[PDB]
Amino acid sequence: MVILGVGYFLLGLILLYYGSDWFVLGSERIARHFNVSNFVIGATVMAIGTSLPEILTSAYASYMHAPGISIGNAIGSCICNIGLVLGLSAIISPIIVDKNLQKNILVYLLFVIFAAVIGIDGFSWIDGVVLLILFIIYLRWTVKNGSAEIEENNPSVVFSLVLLIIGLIGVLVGAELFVDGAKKIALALDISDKVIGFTLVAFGTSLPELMVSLAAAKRNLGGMVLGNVIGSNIADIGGALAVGSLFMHLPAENVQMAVLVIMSLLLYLFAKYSKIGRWQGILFLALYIIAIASLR
Numbered sequence: 001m002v003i004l005g006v007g008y009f010l011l012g013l014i015l016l017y018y019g020s021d022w023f024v025l026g027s028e029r030i031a032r033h034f035n036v037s038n039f040v041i042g043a044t045v046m047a048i049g050t051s052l053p054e055i056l057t058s059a060y061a062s063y064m065h066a067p068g069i070s071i072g073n074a075i076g077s078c079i080c081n082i083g084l085v086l087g088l089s090a091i092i093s094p095i096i097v098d099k100n101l102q103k104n105i106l107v108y109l110l111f112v113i114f115a116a117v118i119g120i121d122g123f124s125w126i127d128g129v130v131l132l133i134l135f136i137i138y139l140r141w142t143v144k145n146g147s148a149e150i151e152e153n154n155p156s157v158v159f160s161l162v163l164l165i166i167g168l169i170g171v172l173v174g175a176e177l178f179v180d181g182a183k184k185i186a187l188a189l190d191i192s193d194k195v196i197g198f199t200l201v202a203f204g205t206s207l208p209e210l211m212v213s214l215a216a217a218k219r220n221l222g223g224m225v226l227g228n229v230i231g232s233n234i235a236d237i238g239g240a241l242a243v244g245s246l247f248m249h250l251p252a253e254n255v256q257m258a259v260l261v262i263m264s265l266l267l268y269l270f271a272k273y274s275k276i277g278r279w280q281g282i283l284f285l286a287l288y289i290i291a292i293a294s295l296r
């Protein structure tokens with residue numbers, strides 16, 4: 001079983017490495033086609049695509065009477081996106097946020113704060129319905145103020161959409177092969193733990209945003225990474241968390257929310273009055289290191 005474990009594992013890495021690049025390249029071409037910013041395409045299409053794991057994970061979890069996993073995976077991802085994902089990207093490719101995007105990040109902050117307050121008692125199904133609607137409004141609002149759309153409306157768009165979709169299939173399949181392969185090596189060597197078994201799928205639903213952002217960062221597409229991080233967090237709260245609430249009340253996790261809010265606050269302040277580069281990225285990483293060392 002270890003043999004096909006090494007197979008699934010390494011193959012997933014290869015599918016993640018190349019899949020992320022194509023997904024980045026395809027998204028970048030679509031944004032130029034739609035005459036919107038890389039932030040927009042990252043906050044919308046890329047975000048939703050790379051948040052599909054969390055949506056399906058917590059829908060299944062809350063349905064299988066494990067709402068702790070549900071809210072845990074949604075919140076955990078949000079912290080990982082800002083901490084690890086955005087942390088590495090800011091260092092690789094620093095970014096200066098224009099004021100059209102600062103307004104968008106401020107909305108993100110207000111959104112999270114809202115989610116944190118109504119979640120103090122936990123998350124009812126009504127809460128999910130509310131958060132899901134704001135998710136929809138945000139998407140439409142993000143598209144329309146990031147829209148300088150003009151055209152009228154063949155072969156150059158087809159190659160773009162193909163590159164994007166296949167790139168997305170690459171990272172989604174590549175990420176779950178990574179987890180399947182790691183799990184298979186983990187039980188064949190008999191080193192399985194039921195909570196580490198959660199930690200690999202926890203980290204697994206963040207592999208898309210991680211690899212995708214690393215690809216965009218190395219092509220100086222920080223604005224795309226930024227939109228991807230902002231969009232994924234909302235998609236985690238307004239989508240993954242929300243859907244989980246429909247099946248069952250999610251228990252309150254105020255410690256992680258407080259962490260998320262602070263990191264979200266820091267994110268806005270850095271974007272509004274400073275930059276998102278090295279020492280900001282280093283700070284994010286540091287906070288992420290502390291978080292994974294002390295949280296529960």
Ligand SMILES: CCCCCCCC/C=C\CCCCCCCC(=O)OC[C@H](O)CO
Nearest residue numbers: 110111113114115117118119120121126127
């Ligand atoms: C519209 C965008 C708002 C963005 C955020 C602005 C600041 C927070 C504003 C109201 C917080 C919620 C007030 C009502 C809930 C208070 C807390 C509570 O414990 O109850 C939650 C309630 O049960 C859940 O249905």
Ligand SMILES: CCCCCCCCCCCCCCC
Nearest residue numbers: 010011012013014015017018019
């Ligand atoms: C070494 C890890 C696996 C890499 C798989 C892709 C290798 C691509 C090498 C260059 C040529 C690609 C085909 C050109 C027709």
Ligand SMILES: CCCCCCCCCCCCCCC
Nearest residue numbers: 124125126128129245246247248
């Ligand atoms: C005040 C809450 C009362 C809840 C009573 C039991 C049924 C809850 C059903 C939630 C359905 C959510 C459907 C989302 C599509």
Ligand SMILES: [Sr+2]
Nearest residue numbers: 050051205206
């Ligand atoms: Sr994700």
Ligand SMILES: [Sr+2]
Nearest residue numbers: 118122123124
């Ligand atoms: Sr509530």
